[PDB]
Design a protein around this nucleic acid. Structure first.
Lengths: 116, 199, 48, 109, 103
RNA sequence: UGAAAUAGAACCUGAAACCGUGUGCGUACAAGCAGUAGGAGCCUCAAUUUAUUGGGGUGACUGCGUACCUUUUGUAUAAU
């Protein structure tokens, strides 16, 4: 029962090369270079999937810091004010209010400013 | 136990040989061992010693810059020997005598349970004619079946020797695969008694 | 038996044999459970 | 339509003919022929031969006015290679590739 | 004319007849869910900030459908350590449509 | 002629490496395993009462990020 591996090898190698499309040079053409580029891409994606949550919080905090400083206090005093006023609004929503509706954020800072 | 033949006569068969149980694990092993006994296992491949030539070292060990080699008939090389080349081997297993007997008891009992056994008083053909037996199977409502009789006739053999899914066997040359492969089994009352005693 | 299709070995009867050196996921890749360089890792090794 | 001529088997490297092909690509039937007849490259005799055959195919088989034609497409491919051995010093041999090229020209309005 | 609500551990800025997908909920298709713990309601100019919830104000949403997201391949590789593990993932979600924001 | 002629004699099928041609996008002030997570712009298809989404291509700009195997106490290793 001789088994020829050409057919299964072809679609196996093709599966890796299809996943390596858009890569430069040998990384999208030859399997030996493409297989470890696909693995490395998956490793970056797994780590960057944690770092994304880490990077957007930095973005929200900076946006909130700009908004609070435009009218009144800083971010460090803003978060303390929201915490003392029992305001649960997340930094994601706050940064969206600051960047897209400045009247509401002005009213939102006042509630934090009167609480300290 | 109490079965009825085609005409209507009452025949009683022992439960120890026709109503036992279905042991699928037991039946599978005996059936699959019979199929392994059908293999003849005649094949081989050449090892390093068997392939033509390849006795000298193709080049010196050091200096040439090539991977070291000891023979051109290495299993790594094209045209080289087979590492672990196949040889002829025996595929027949041992089924215990009681295991074979128990499997045939299980199969026959199961054949009755799914209405695949047909008891007939006798099944004889006057002339060695395929048409005569084809017509007799039609009235028996078994166009494709396995006929089991004692002393298979010398003209009943010729009648069934051409019908596609039909075989006539002696009770002493009935195998576990034949009882399962065929759609129905037409066993004569005389042949059913032989299985009653031999199982 | 019913048919040559529905004949099963009665689970627990059969076990899959172990194949050494067939990749990372199989649990026996690259060494066959032999460990690292040593006499017992070599081709003709024995316990004597 | 597009009238095609092929010059499969030209005994010359493809790299040497791609330079000649890059100067007649897109040119009119007349400018391309002047470029080819005053070129110093060997690949120009091969391109002109295939271009002229494409012109006759348009004039004869397709009944098309050659005065309004143009080199619509041209590309040079690699052909079959003749493999030779070249002795070197110290009893060593290399492989020599004698490359050939296929020349495909398409003329059209 | 917007509200801030909590669903699936996250917070969402919603508007009327907006398709918003959230974490999986135990509700049938077409079932209406009411969120009576909104964090903030801004109706044009009036701002009602909850501390931590806006009393009375609520949002009614309808469960459009439940489904899986895009397939993620999860690749783990330890170099020089004979280790490699891959698995797939599809996150469950519900599609909500915000009907109205009750003040 | 043939059903078929990118079945035309190097002739069934005709993969990959490798080499061309065409189209779309990007690219000549910017430093590195060449990806990944974001992301503007552009191009192209399907709906939709008409740039609003969705699919596809590209990837300006930002963050992070020194291949794989083997062998090792320990390798981006300038160790195999």
């Amino acid at each position: 029962a001789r088994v020829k591996r050409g057919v299964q090898a072809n679609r196996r190698h093709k599966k890796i090369l299809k996943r390596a499309k858009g890569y430069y040079g040998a990384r999208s053409r030859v399997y030996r270079v493409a297989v470890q580029a696909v693995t490395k891409a998956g490793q970056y994606a797994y780590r960057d999937r944690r770092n994304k949550k880490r990077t957007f919080r930095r973005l929200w905090i900076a946006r909130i810091n700009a908004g609070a400083r435009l009218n009144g206090l800083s971010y460090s005093r803003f978060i303390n004010g929201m915490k003392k006023a029992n305001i649960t609004i997340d930094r994601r929503v706050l940064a969206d209010i600051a960047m897209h509706d400045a009247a509401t954020f002005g009213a939102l800072v006042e509630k934090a400013k009167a609480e300290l | 136990m109490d079965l009825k033949t085609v005409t209507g006569a009452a025949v009683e068969l022992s439960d120890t040989a026709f109503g036992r149980e279905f042991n699928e694990a037991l039946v599978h092993q005996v059936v699959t061992a019979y199929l392994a006994g059908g293999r003849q296992g005649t094949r081989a491949q050449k090892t390093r010693a068997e392939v033509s030539g390849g006795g000298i070292k193709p080049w010196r060990q050091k200096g040439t810059g090539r991977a070291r080699a000891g023979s051109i008939r290495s299993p790594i090389w094209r045209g080289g020997g087979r590492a672990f080349a196949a040889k002829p081997q025996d595929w027949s297993q041992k089924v215990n005598r009681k295991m074979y007997r128990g499997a045939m008891q299980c199969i026959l009992a199961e054949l009755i349970r799914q209405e695949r056994l047909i008891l007939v008083e006798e099944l004889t053909i006057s002339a060695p004619k395929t048409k005569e037996l084809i017509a007799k199977l039609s009235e028996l409502n078994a166009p494709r079946a396995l006929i089991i009789t004692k002393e298979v006739d010398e003209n009943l053999y010729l009648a069934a020797r051409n019908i596609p899914h039909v075989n006539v066997l002696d009770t002493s040359e009935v195998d576990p695969v034949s009882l399962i492969a065929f759609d129905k089994v037409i066993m004569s009352v005389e042949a059913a008694k032989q299985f009653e005693e031999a199982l | 038996g019913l048919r040559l299709n529905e004949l099963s070995p009665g689970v627990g009867a059969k076990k899959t044999a172990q194949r050494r050196g067939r990749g990372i996921g199989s649990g026996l890749g690259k060494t066959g459970g032999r460990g690292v360089k040593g006499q017992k890792s070599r081709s003709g090794s024995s316990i004597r | 339509m597009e009238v095609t001529a092929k010059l499969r088997g030209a005994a010359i490297s493809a790299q040497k003919v791609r330079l000649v092909a890059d100067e007649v690509r897109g040119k009119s039937i007349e400018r391309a022929l002047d470029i080819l007849t005053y070129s110093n490259k060997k690949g120009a005799v091969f391109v002109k031969k295939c271009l002229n055959s494409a012109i006759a195919n348009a004039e004869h088989n397709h009944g098309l006015d050659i005065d309004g034609l143009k080199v619509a497409t041209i590309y040079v491919d690699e052909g079959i290679t003749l493999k030779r051995i070249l002795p070197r010093a110290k009893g060593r041999a290399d492989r020599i590739s004698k490359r050939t090229c296929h020349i495909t020209i398409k003329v059209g309005e | 004319m917007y509200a801030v609500i909590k669903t699936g551990g996250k917070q969402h800025r919603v508007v009327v007849d907006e398709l918003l997908k959230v974490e999986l909920l135990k509700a049938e298709q077409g079932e209406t869910i009411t969120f009576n713990d909104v964090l903030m309601v801004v109706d044009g100019e009036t701002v009602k900030i909850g501390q931590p919830v806006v009393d009375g104000a609520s949002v009614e949403v309808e469960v459009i459908e439940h489904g899986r997201g895009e397939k993620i391949r999860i690749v783990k590789h330890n170099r020089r350590k004979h280790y490699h593990k891959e698995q797939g993932h599809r996150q469950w979600y519900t599609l909500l449509k915000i009907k109205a924001i009750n003040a």
